[PDB]
Design goal:
structural protein, 9 repeat domains, Major vault protein (chain A), part of a larger assembly, 3 chains, 51 residues, 2 strands
């Protein structure tokens, strides 16, 4: 699987399937969330700007 | 990301269990717990004179 | 923007948690709390003689 972002217009190609709409994560000064890289199980904590 | 604002004249101790390192901070600052950090839950005496 | 008018002969302490800096001001002025600043809530004795 992979992610496509940026100000553009996408369409389901004749080979791929859309899984989900990546959204909803805004962070500011001294704020963040916990994320786990599923491939390696590397739990970490990103903070600061939007991610 | 769980974060606690430390009082002006107080202190808090945490330990990053994943990395094996302790840390303690004091003053009017905010502690941001890393993915495996935990606060030192200190049960103290209080109530009416001392319990 | 939350702002409090400090009394003539009094003082107030705040801490900008995002930037890690404390500040205290006195006199007949108005304190304007930055996005992550907070007042020092000081619970004092009062009531009838002293509580």
């Amino acid at each position: 699987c992979w992610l496509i972002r940026g100000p553009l217009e996408y369409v389901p190609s004749a080979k791929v399937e859309v899984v989900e709409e990546r959204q909803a994560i805004p962070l500011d000064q001294n704020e963040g969330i916990y994320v786990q890289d599923v491939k390696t199980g590397k739990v970490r904590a990103v903070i600061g700007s939007t991610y | 990301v769980v974060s606690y604002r430390v009082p002006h004249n107080a202190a808090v101790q945490v330990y990053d269990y994943r990395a094996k390192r302790a840390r303690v901070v004091f003053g009017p600052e905010l502690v941001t717990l890393d993915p495996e950090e935990q606060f030192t839950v200190l049960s103290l005496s209080a109530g009416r004179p001392k319990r």
